[PDB]
């Protein structure tokens, strides 16, 4: 994982076998992508099929333009849920990134909290509370003068999708 440039480093959990949930979440997304590619490939063959049956294989199913329509109708429907889930998360992420950049432009880099400038239990409870407070603020646009709390390294499964 090659490391991000300074205009985006603030948005990464970084330093400026056991099981894990994220392993399994990621590998299922990896596996999902394969099937989507294969479906696309088969849809890719349809125009040439009246040649790529008989010139290639002893026997195969006859099919027609009307059937291609209905297949395509069916395929689109089955993707809508995952599409909505992808889109909504991506928009939310891009918004948080662009806002953090605009604030980095308008703010003062002399301040120790500027994105370009920047204990156990209590620091951890600090991290968690900063996160919960940033979450509650963000819902109503009550977040005008501090960086949104975010990490992108969890989002590997939306990257695959």
């Amino acid at each position: 994982a090659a490391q991000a440039p300074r205009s985006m480093q603030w948005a990464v959990r970084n330093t400026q076998n056991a099981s894990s949930y994220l392993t399994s979440a990621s590998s299922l997304a990896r596996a999902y992508s394969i099937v989507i590619r294969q479906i696309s490939d088969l849809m890719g063959l349809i125009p040439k099929y009246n040649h790529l049956v008989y010139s290639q294989i002893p026997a195969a199913v006859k099919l027609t333009y009307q059937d291609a329509v209905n297949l395509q109708n069916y395929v689109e429907e089955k993707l809508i849920p995952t599409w909505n889930w992808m889109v909504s998360i991506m928009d939310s992420t891009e918004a948080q990134l662009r806002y953090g950049s605009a604030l980095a432009s308008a703010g003062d880099p002399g301040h120790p909290n500027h994105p370009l400038h920047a204990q156990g239990m209590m620091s951890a409870r600090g991290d968690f509370l900063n996160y919960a407070l940033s979450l509650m603020r963000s819902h109503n646009d009550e977040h005008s003068d501090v960086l949104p709390v975010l990490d992108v390294c969890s989002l590997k499964h939306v990257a695959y999708v």
Binding site: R98, S105, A106, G107, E142, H143, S144
Partner: protein, 267 residues
Amino acid sequence: LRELLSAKDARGMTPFMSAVSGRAYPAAITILETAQKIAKAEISSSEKEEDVFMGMVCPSGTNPDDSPLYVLCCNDTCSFTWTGAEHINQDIFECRTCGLLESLCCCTECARVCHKGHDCKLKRTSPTAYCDCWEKCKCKTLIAGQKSARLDLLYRLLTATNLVTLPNSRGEHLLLFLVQTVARQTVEHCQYRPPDMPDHDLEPPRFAQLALERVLQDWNALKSMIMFGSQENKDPLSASSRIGHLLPEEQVYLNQQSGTIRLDCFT
């Protein structure tokens, strides 16, 4: 009279603002009544009644740190008037402009008024200390004045003027200033005990609590505090307040959020 009361001294202050700065609350009252009469006498002019009145009370271009309603609240006594030379746990400041370097110090009120405009910093030594300012300097917080007049003047200002809406020189709305004051006094005053050096053994001030209770009854004060950090109620200081010089895309993002750090810190 209008000219004499709108004329500014060598520090920018009208006679009214001077009466407040000097704790001459009955004189401030006398002038403030008179200033209302004067503004109400010149209603025949092409100016609005208010412009004249604001000119005499708190003139345009006044540094916010000198706005009278704020100054009246800052006018408390030095802790030494009630602690004497006893050591109590309180906040303390060094003042380098005055040679009050890190072994020495003054209490919060001296730092706010006796050392206004100096290099002063919040000190890191133990809080169990009295305040050296009455001994090392010409300390202006030793005199209480007339308490009943101080309170009467506050009531009048709150109904006479829109000054409640201004933030101070650190972006603190007046209410956020008062409530921090009460919270601080609550700890300091619980250490008080009944019994060439200045008059000690006085009773501690309850003005901040009385002032907080009265201000909280004013709709304008309350609305002005709760709407703080809205796009209309633009915080002048430390708060992304200059934006027009950035390219338009970053403005359309950065206008959309709104602030609550101070409203949350108050609540």
